[PDB]
Structures are given as structure tokens and as C-alpha cells.
Amino acid sequence: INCISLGEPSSIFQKIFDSFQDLNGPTLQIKNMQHLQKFLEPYTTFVVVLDEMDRLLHANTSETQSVRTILELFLLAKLPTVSFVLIGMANSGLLPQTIVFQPYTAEQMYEIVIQKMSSLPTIIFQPMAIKFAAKKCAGNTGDLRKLFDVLRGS
Amino acid sequence: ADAQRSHYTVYPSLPHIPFVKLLSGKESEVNVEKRWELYHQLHSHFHDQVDHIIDNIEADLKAEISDLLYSRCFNTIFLLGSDSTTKIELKDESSRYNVLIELTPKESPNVRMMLRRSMYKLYSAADAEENDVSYDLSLVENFKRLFGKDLAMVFNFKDVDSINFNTLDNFIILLKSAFKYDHVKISLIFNINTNLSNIEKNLRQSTIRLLKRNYHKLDVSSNKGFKYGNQIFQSFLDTVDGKLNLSDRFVEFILSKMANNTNHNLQLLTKMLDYSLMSYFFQNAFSVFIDPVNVDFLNDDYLKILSRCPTFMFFVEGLIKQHLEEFFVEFLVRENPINGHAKFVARFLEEELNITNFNLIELYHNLLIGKLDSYLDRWSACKEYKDRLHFEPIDTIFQELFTLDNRSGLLTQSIFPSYKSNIEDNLLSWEQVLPSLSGDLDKIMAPVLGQLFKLYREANMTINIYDFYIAFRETLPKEEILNFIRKDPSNTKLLELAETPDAFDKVALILFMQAIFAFENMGLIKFQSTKSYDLVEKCVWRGI
Amino acid sequence: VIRKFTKKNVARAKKKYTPFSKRFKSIAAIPDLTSLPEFYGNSRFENKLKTTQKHQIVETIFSKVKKQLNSSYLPARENEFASIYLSAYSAIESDSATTIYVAGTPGVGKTLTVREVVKELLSSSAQREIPDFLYVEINGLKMVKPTDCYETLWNKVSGERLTWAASMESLEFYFKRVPKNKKKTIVVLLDELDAMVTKSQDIMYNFFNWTTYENAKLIVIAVANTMDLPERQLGNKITSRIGFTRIMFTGYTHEELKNIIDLRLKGLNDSFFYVDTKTGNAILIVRKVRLRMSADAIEIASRKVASVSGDARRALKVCKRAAEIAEKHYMAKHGYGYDGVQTVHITHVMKALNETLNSHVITFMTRLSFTAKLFIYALLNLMKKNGSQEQELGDIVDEIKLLIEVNGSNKFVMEIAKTLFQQGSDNISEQLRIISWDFVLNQLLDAGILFKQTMKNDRICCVKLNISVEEAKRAMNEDETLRNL
DNA sequence: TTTGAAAAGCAAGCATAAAAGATCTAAACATAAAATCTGTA
DNA sequence: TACAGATTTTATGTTTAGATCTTTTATGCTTGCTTTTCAAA
């Protein structure tokens, strides 16, 4: 589920229900994490991947109501006798396990480019050019998208 | 953790009378049951009459408001001492809708909101009594065309001493514009608790001239002629008569505490009387013998503490200088007619003499102390009954187990404590609160709050917190701190911090910062600057 | 039931609330959407502005020039055209999703170039060498709400009409989940991109994040006014998704502007018309009259416009204004009405370039009454004396009174003082303000010459000059009475 | 009984805390048309 | 299947409670010179 493309952060439980319950069966109206917590008791491990969960804070209000959704999601993925895991991707003891994806180096960028172009029969690039582009794209915060734009523009 | 929440519900896991065993744990459980039951009959008998008195207060006040309301200008009523809780009711009079519109300072941020709430209440009442409209004064203009009836509006301005006076002035000038309509009459009720002149000098003089055309005044407050206090205390005297007598010091305690409260002194009187009755039925074991059928339940402890009376002291000293259970059980029949005499002189005082501005509690106090004649030598109309109304109290024997007296200082700790004085005295003389039983450290060093307060009390305007911390260090002993900090080998971090050569100063700084922010939370100390945190100001002084 | 307030003018559109994710029961249940009768584009107002022409209008010798120089009718943009066309053609032919960022100053041909690119792409798709696509045009300044773009784009894709939130999850479902074989390529022109910038920046993220989806087949061509917009207003996610490649449209040089104007003046310049001398109507091939607009005039206008903005709109409007000045002089000379050589000279071009430069503010202050000039003179005197940019109105009153009472021996002051303080009348007492004091104060406030703060005490209220001090000084010492003293 | 001298007092200077309010914004409170659900006929 | 009615969705208006920032004014420390009341000759 991509969190930004939802109209409100309060309906995501419903969309989780709208991702899981079949259309032929009854369609209950999920208001909060209590209804989803009731829904997941008779079960089969439920995996959700929330992309941009950082946009699950509220830009208004203050500290209290800004965390209103992420804390109720964290409680739902930590209470016993459910099978609801929560993978959250955001941009830069019940606390979630933290994995920090690192910015790529030049050699990692070179290996990704060679692996993506290995399906092609003939490489139209000299490898030194890919190395030069990768080392110019390997700054303090260098991303693979910039390398793709640079090569495509080449 | 529940300690880090704002609010949480706990249902405790469960696996009948709050009265305890007296006479050093030798009172029988049946006496505990009789004390509980008999306290409940006395308490219920008091509060039934208190409830009837309270409903009489509201009924008579509603009657006089309705009298003053119905017998081209406002009809203005100034209710002095209002402390507004009255539910004013109006007539069900045909061909004219009577609407009561109540306004508070919370409902009055400006004139527009006052008019909008007034017209919404007017339309709601006129729809409930029998298309949408604009909530402005033109609804008053077209009232006969929409409902066929005349309009009588009564405005109840609740807590006028809190409302903005410019807004109230402009609302009254706005309401003046409805005087050009023949079907409208307007009444205004102002609930005042300060004075008439206070509101007279916060309104413009044209509005004062407007209100002067038709205005009446009426006193509302609970100390109006004392007759509502005088009932309630007499109701207590109708409850305790023949059972216990009141002490004179308890009655003058009542007088002083009711003289300190303006708006609500009736409920304070009821609270003090109730707490005295609770204290009596919780403390004395002789309150079973208030019921005259328990006189066979005497034991050795009852007679052993019965003989320790000053009245029994004086009686047996007189009988020894002249020349027990049966002597006790026969002397419980006298009625102590001071209450009946007080009621008799009250009904004589407003029966024919027309003296009604008296306090019955003052009369009962002067009757208790024997200075009744000095009390009724003030009115100069009852000179002819200095022997008709004369009474001499009789000091009966062992009445000090059957009494309501204020000498232990319990009422002035539970109902009106010296709060901040108690806080600073427990801070400064802590040995008083804490038992005098870390064996070698508790005898030598005070608790850190008490030592810090004793260094705090002896300081100036501005305390330099570093030098104050040095003054806190020099009171502490280094040797037994270093000895006691090594008395737990399980925690090795404490031992390796104790091995450091700057251990004592560091530990003293831990205790000093903890105690300083304890005082900052309690309000004793203040950082005058938001940043820096290098100086403090004292806030509170002992004994003020 | 009695309402506390009423809403009696609510107009709600017939928009459904159920999004596209719940139309069919499965991903496999979705048909090929290119065959649906409502999807992918599968006006009634044009006849409302028709009338009956019962007259015959006269089109003169300069009428065709003015009609032809309009913005409604691609020489200098061929590298930008090639870049946009090649990126979009590669994105269409490979079934890819691509963002093309184009930025520039007003009137440099951004919208024209993107529209010419999509016309050649549709013509290329009509010859069956690239797959067919749907072209959507979304202008952010033509929306009432910024979320209405969600309303617009989905209505262009499906033909349904939904509310903006349901349209947003409909577009998300369509771009991510529906496979390529059941879809059609969509090319979206987002024009005035800054107008679609909100505090949440959700529209920006959604529109540029759909171009990162594998199944989307979406080409977003975003037109900006600056190149540093994603760094200044947008976050790092949206800046990363927009990309490093960014096409800048520079302002036109004067060669390019001259080529544009000469391209619009091909077939009319150095040509002959048949002109009626009775009415004035002229026909392109009774007198045979040759029409010219000189190349030196066009090059002067092109150089001026290229140095100021490089704007094709301004170059065309300056040429049209010069032709209208010439045509007005022509109708004045020959007495023509609105029913051998005629030239748009260089002098008309200089007049058109100078009419937006002539500084009417000084002329306006020169043509004011004596009381308004006296007010401005007193205010300037106070700024000279105490050196402050804001002066209290009571100080202006006192220094006007001092200026009247010190230079009394001037004959104009002896003529004007009774008018100023009594309106030339006995039985009118002497006035604390001058006559028309509030009138000239409000008049100078209406023009923007003055700023007045919002205070209720009229004496301590401050007044500041909003115009430059030197132009007020030259307007004041143009006046013969005020420069005398 | 004096004496004088350190404590108290007064005014200028100036950095700074704070009162007042201008401007705004979130949150409770409130209404409403179109769409969607829902329980039977 | 369909339909009358109840509920939801989306959309906007009304009123109160509080935050933030700006401008002007009280205030609190510093420094230098003047009075003055109580611990010793």
C-alpha cells in the first residue's frame, strides 16, 4: 500500500480489509485498528508493506495526534495471537527493527548497470564511461535515478 | 508503562463497614454495628431537614422573583449576592409567549453572538411552545406575524461581575431598539455579587439613565437576615437534642469560619457539622450509649475510661471533702434544655417583638457561655424580659464523653488547613514527619529536601546556584557517603564511580540537582531567565 | 427541526464515490480497456455565440497585418523540439513511463513546442509506426481546486465522473495494477506546474511517482516557469523522481524574434492590395497600393524585446500596436469608417515601445489641484527636515499652516488663503483643516501615491510616499508657485 | 553625647523581559446533496 | 429484482481556543554621587 495515494490516513485499515477480504463475501466497514484486530483473529500470515509510512503523520495538530496512526499500527503488529506483520518504508521493547538502506557507491552502481544490461546482447557503452558516470553520481547522497537519467541522456 | 500515559482504566482483581474497633482493639463488633447504624439515623435526620430547608430557599426565591417580575422601558431586577443557580420559571399566560433567555460571559464574546444566541433561543422556545429565519432582532419585529401572539422576553444575565461591560452595554442599547414594537416587552435580570456601584461605574451614563426608569433591587445571598442559616443549625439542634451538647469553642469556630465565606456559608456550616458528627462517631466508644437500650453493655474498659472526667473529678472531690455503674446509668435521662430554651427565645424574638435580624448561632454561643444578657442588651427593645428570658447553664457530670468540641485541632486540619505553612514546616522540621528509628547514614544526614530547605530559608533575593551547591556539599559528610556507597557489591558501576577521586562532589551534585528541580516543581524556587540557569529567586517565605 | 444556520446555495456535482479498484472482482476480470466504449475519449457550446451578419465590415490595408500577428496563428525551437520528441517517441515505442521537465520564462514557446510535439506524435501514431496513445492537457491555472486535476485526468481516461479522492485511488490502481496489454499509453501535459503545488505536495508526488511504475505507460510532460522549482518548493523524493535532465527554454534572441515576425509577415509584406477609395476595403491580389513593414523597424522592436524579455508575445504585440497606430492615422487622414505605398514605419515602432515607458505619475501630479500639491510639498518638506520616511498627519497640517502663514506676502497666498480656510466666504468660520483636505488625502490614497496606516486618531496617523521622492520633487518644482518659495 | 561609616537612596544608561495585539490556524460544532447501503416486499 | 428509507461521503460554513510574531513599554542590573541611623569612642 502506498500511503500518499490514500485520501486520508484513517482509512488504511479499510484498505487493508479491501486488500484481503474477497468481493463475494460480506464487506464490513473498518473504522479503526480494533475492527481489523477483530478481523484477523480467526487466521495464514498477513503481510502488509506500507510505502512512505512517514506520510502517516498529520501535518496539522501537534505531537499527540500526529502519531495517532503509526502507534495504532505498531500496536496491531505487536499484540499476541494475530499474524499481522508490518514493513514500513520511509525516507530520510516494542520498537520496530530498523534497517537503513545506504546510498550506493560507484562500484555498486557499476555492478547494477552491468547486471541490468546483461540481458542486452551488445553493450553500447564503453565501461570506463559507466565508471565515470557512476563516480560522478556517487556523492554524499547519490541515487541510482540520477545515474539512469545521465546514461539515458547520453 | 501506565506511568507514562495520560489516563487509564484499571479493574482491580477482587478475591464491610469503615468503622474500626475502639478501646485499644477491645470493642465488640456489635458496638461497631450500633455506632454505624446510629450515626446513619442521626445523619439522615439532619439531612432530611437540610433538604427541606434548601427546597424552601429555592421556592421562596422563585416566588419573590415572580412577584417582582409581574407587578416603553426595560423591567430591570438587580439580584445582589446571586451566585446564580436559580431556575427561573415564568407564567403560562395566554395570547403572549413568555420566553426566558439566559446569557453567561462564556456565551458573550461580542454583541453579535449575544443577539444570535438570544434569537435562536427565542425561535426554539416559540417553536416548541406551539421555514427558517434570520437570527437578528427583526425576528422580534415580526413575532406577531409568525406566531400570532405578543412577546414577553426575560433576560437572565448570569454572573454580570464576569461579563465584559462594554459588550453588555452595547447589547442593552441594541435591545432598546425593540421598544418601537407594541407587541414586545423586555425584562432584564442582572445577577450581581459585588455591589451596584461597581456595575454603575462600568456602564455609560446614558445606559444608567435608561435602566433607572423601572428598576428594583432584591437580596439573594444566603446571609439574608440569617433565617436560612438559623433554620439549618436549629435542625442540627433538632437532631442532637438529648443526645450530645455543643461546646462553646466549637460554636465560635462555626461563627469565625462562616464569617470568612461570602456566597456559600450554608454548605460550609453543613460540612463542618457533618465532619464533627463523623469525628465523634468514629472516635468515641461511648456513642453506643446514645441509644438508651445499650446500658447493659458496660464493661471494665468503659468504666475505666469513664472515671477520667473533669466533672467526675470535681464531683468525687466534693463528696470526699464533704464526708458507679448504677450511678452512671441513672444519670443519662436529663434532657439539657438549652436547645429548647434557644428555640423558645427565638420564637419569642420574632413572635411579637418583630426582631428578625439576629443570628441564632450567636445567641446559642452567648447562651452557652452564660453571656446571653450581653447579647440581648444590643437591640434596646427587649429590656422588659431580662428575667423572663434568663437562663443559667448547668454543668452536668460526664458530659465530656457526650459532646461535640473543637480542641484537638482536627477540624482545622481537615477542613481549613494551613496548607503552605504545613508544607514549609514539614520541610524544615522533618524529624517530626519521619520516624527516628544505611544504618549509620540516616542518623547523621537529613533528607535532601529538608537540608536544602534549611539552607534555602537563610538566603537573600537571588541565590547563586553554584555557591548554594557548595553550601549543600559542606553539610554532607564525605566519609560515610563513601562507606555507604560501597555497601552493595552487586552494582559494579557504583563501585567504579566510587573509586573515582571526584566521587563525593559528583554524588552531591546528583542529589542537589534532583532536589532543586523538586523545589522548582513545588513552586518554592524560580529561574528568572529562560536560558543560562545560573541564578535562582526564592518564591515563598515560611510563616506568611 | 430548527437549524442554527442554513446553506441555501449548495451546488453538488453528480460524482460517484466508488473507485476503479472495486469495478471488477479480480485483476483477471478487467477487460482490455482500449475496447471499452467510454474509455480513452470514446463540445455543445459553439453555436451559442452565433448571430446574423447584416452588415459588411471594412478590412483596411493594415487589417490583415493586425489579424495575422495574433498569438492564435516552429522556426527557432528545433533542438528543444527534437529533445522532447525523441524522448516521448522512445517512451511511446518501448511502452515506458517517462517524465519530461521543461522550464522557462513567459512567451518563449514552451506550450507551443509541446503541442507541436504531440501533434507530430499523433500523426506518427496515425501511420502505425508507434502504438496509439491518449493526449491529456491539464493546466493548473485553469483549475478551481488543485485536486480537480485528479478529477480531470481520470475523466479523460475512463469517462467516469468521480470525486477527487476516489479518482486518485482509481488512477493509482490503473497505473500500477492493470497490465500493459489491457492499457493504452497516456501522454499528460502538466502546464503551470507551480499552480499545482500545495502544502502536502501530494499531487506532485502522485503525478511523478506514477511515472516510476512498471505497468503505467504514462508520459508526464511538466512545464515550469523556473528550473530551480523542484529544489526550492518540492522535496527530495519529487526532485529525485523528476530527474537530472531538465530542458530550459531560453529567451529568444533578436534574430529569432525577427524570424518569427518575418514568418508571420510572409505573403503580406512587399505585396499589393486592391483598395477602394470610397469605403476603404482592401483585397489581397480602386487603386493598387503596396504594403510594407520595414525590416529596420522589426529589428529595432526585436532587439528591444529580446533584451527586456525575449518574449514572442511582446514582439508580436509591439508590431501589432505599431500597425494599429499607423492604421489609426490612415483612417484619420482618409476619413474611413467602421462599417500608393502604405508602410508601418520605424516611428510607429518607437511610439509603441515608448508608450509603456513615459511615466504618467509625474504628469498626474503636475495636473493636480493646488491643495494636493501643497500637501505633497509639505510632506516633502517634513522628509527634508526630520529625515523620516513616515510623517504624522498632524505635522503635515501644522506645516501647511506654517507655509501659508510665513510666505503671506506672495500674491497667490493672499488670493488663496480665504479660499483655503473659509472657502471664500464670510459666515464660515476659520477651519482647522484646509478646504478639500480629506478629499485630496483620499485622492492621493486612491492613486497609490500615498500609504496611510490604519489608526483612528487622525493626528498621530502616519503617511508615507509610495512613489520615489525624486519624481515627486520634479513634479513639485514644475509648479511655478511652489518652486518660487 | 558624639562620630563616622557602612547601609540605604536617587538618578542616568541601557540591555532586555513582557504586555498588547495583529494575524492566523486548528478544532469543535454544524449543515447538506449525492451516493451507497440495507432490510424487506 | 427492486425500492423506500437509513447511513455514509464529500463538501462546506460557524464559532471558539490557542500559537506565533512584532512593536512598544516596564524593569532590572550597573555605576557614580548623596543622605543617614546605629555600633563603637
Ligand SMILES: Nc1ncnc2c1ncn2[C@@H]1O[C@H](COP(=O)(O)OP(=O)(O)OP(=O)(O)O)[C@@H](O)[C@H]1O
Ligand atoms: N518559435 C515560435 N514561432 C512562432 N511563434 C511563436 C514561437 N514561440 C512563441 N510564439 C508565439 O508566442 C505565443 C505564446 O507562446 P507560448 O504560449 O508557447 O508561451 P509559453 O512559453 O508557454 O509562455 P507562458 O509561460 O506564459 O505560458 C505562441 O502562441 C505564438 O503565437
Ligand SMILES: [Mg+2]
Ligand atoms: Mg504556456
